[PDB]
Every structure is written in structure tokens, then in C-alpha cells.
């Protein structure tokens, strides 16, 4: 399967996600600093464990 670019990102703070939209792309004109996310990309891994 392919990876998604939505906002479904785990183990990140609320501030790290408040700079994103409902689709997963930062709004135009956002004062982003270092160490932050611009687009949330998440990929499906193999099962590897049940």
C-alpha cells in the first residue's frame, strides 16, 4: 500500500500539530521554527508482529 499525507501522526505534541490543517499541509504564512513538521507523511509498515 501507499503512504498517506494526512495529519494522523502519533507521539507528537499538540503544538507540533497546531501548525497543520485538516489535510496535512501547513497554512500559507506560518512562522515555523527549526525542528517542526511541514507535511505529515506516514507510511504503512509490515505486520512483523501480532
Amino acid at each position: 500500500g501507499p503512504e498517506e499525507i494526512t495529519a494522523d501522526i502519533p507521539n507528537v505534541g499538540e503544538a507540533a500539530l497546531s501548525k497543520l490543517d485538516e489535510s496535512g499541509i501547513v497554512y500559507i504564512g506560518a512562522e515555523v521554527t527549526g525542528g517542526d513538521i511541514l507535511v505529515g507523511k506516514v507510511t504503512p509498515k509490515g505486520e512483523t508482529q501480532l
Binding site: I28, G29, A30, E31, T33
Partner: protein, 228 residues
């Protein structure tokens, strides 16, 4: 046995810049008071520069609103040089609105009684489109020194609205300071030294209050020289 220097005359040759003279000062002290006063004057005074803006229809400083012949970055760079005196409180919101052909100046800023403008003829930006209108919000606060845009992000008070635009502060009311010493009036004695200080300001502060504040700072800070 010393002679106390007392301010006796002040010359406002122009509104922008003036000069101040001091009366009898004993020999040797001429380069003491002059250098220290010049340097404290040039370094640390209460400034009232603009610190925040909110343009009506832009999202960042790099865009260009329709109808204005300048870039928004150019707008902010021009607005940084605006000189404003504040008397009432430590932070006041200033509102602007103008439409139609012609430039916009300080006289176009709303002029509530507490805040007074010093340079009405300072130009902000031209305007070309007939039905073009800009309604910017101006934020000014008191302070001192030199606070840049980068370091003040430390507040972390959720101060991230899209329409709020930061500037580089210029908290320094004085611009050019000069001084020199010369022989004073006879004063029924020999070797009397007087110094004259020429002060170039943006007009926010009058020289007499400036000298009073600088001397008060110097004396209060030096009062720590009473050891055990």
C-alpha cells in the same frame, strides 16, 4: 572647594536637533563628564518604536497587496523609521485607514490625545489604484536598547495569528551625539571650562529631560560605590 555645574542655557536651533551648555566646570573634568554623558546618552534611553503590525489583507511580509506600488517588506522597512512619542501608558494601539489616489503619511494615522506624532511629513507609501484601501493596525510599546525580531519569539504565549507581522525594533531616540570643551566665562578666576553638547534626535525627547534622565541613571548606578 569644587564648583557644581548647573545647566544655565539650552538652544533649540531646530525641532529635530538642539544643543545644551554647562556652566562652570573645573579643569580636568571636561573629558570625564562629556564622554560619560555622551555614551550613556547614545546607549540607554527610553525608546518608543513600533514593534508589531497587522495589515488587513496579507498573510506574510513577502506578499504584495493589490493597489500599492511598494512591497509589504518595503512597507515594514519604511514604517520602522517612523518616530512616535508616547505619554499616557507603556503600550498603545494605533489605527490607520486611507483610500484614494495619493500617498499616506503620519497625519493619516488616527491621533487620539494620549499619543502625539512628531513628524507628520514622513511618507509611508504611495497609492495608485483609485478604489484601493489599506487598514493596518500599528502596535507601539516603550523600552530600551535593541531588541531584534528573532529573540522576542521566546514569549511562547500562543502569539501566532496569521495576520500579525513582526518588525525589527529601533529603540534609540537619539541618533547623533557630539560634544566639546572650551574656555568658559571669566567667573572672576582663571581656567574655567565649559562644554557644549550637540544632540541630534528624531524629536521624541527634549534635550533637558534627556540630560536629567541620563545623569540620574549615572548617579543611581554609581551609588553602588559605597563599599564595606
Amino acid at each position: 572647594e569644587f564648583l557644581k555645574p548647573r545647566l544655565v542655557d539650552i538652544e533649540q536651533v531646530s525641532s529635530t536637533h538642539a544643543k545644551v551648555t554647562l556652566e562652570p566646570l573645573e579643569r580636568g573634568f571636561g573629558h570625564t563628564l562629556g564622554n560619560a554623558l555622551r555614551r550613556i546618552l547614545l546607549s540607554s534611553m527610553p525608546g518608543c518604536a513600533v514593534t508589531e503590525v497587522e495589515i488587513d489583507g496579507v498573510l506574510h511580509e513577502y506578499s504584495t497587496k493589490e493597489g500599492v506600488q511598494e512591497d509589504i517588506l518595503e512597507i515594514l522597512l519604511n514604517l520602522k523609521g517612523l518616530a512616535v512619542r508616547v505619554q499616557g501608558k507603556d503600550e498603545v494601539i494605533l489605527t490607520l485607514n486611507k483610500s484614494g489616489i495619493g500617498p499616506v503619511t503620519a497625519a493619516d494615522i488616527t491621533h487620539d490625545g494620549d499619543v502625539e506624532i512628531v513628524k507628520p511629513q514622513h511618507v509611508i507609501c504611495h497609492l495608485t489604484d483609485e478604489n484601493a484601501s489599506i487598514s493596518m493596525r500599528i502596535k507601539v510599546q516603550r523600552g530600551r536598547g535593541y531588541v531584534p525580531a528573532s529573540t522576542r519569539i521566546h514569549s511562547e504565549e500562543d502569539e501566532r495569528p496569521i495576520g500579525r507581522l513582526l518588525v525589527d525594533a529601533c529603540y534609540s531616540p537619539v541618533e547623533r551625539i557630539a560634544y566639546n570643551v572650551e574656555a568658559a566665562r571669566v567667573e572672576q578666576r582663571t581656567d574655567l571650562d565649559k562644554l557644549v553638547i550637540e544632540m541630534e534626535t528624531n524629536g521624541t525627547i527634549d534635550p533637558e529631560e534627556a540630560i536629567r534622565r541620563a545623569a540620574t541613571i549615572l548617579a543611581e548606578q554609581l551609588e553602588a560605590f559605597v563599599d564595606l
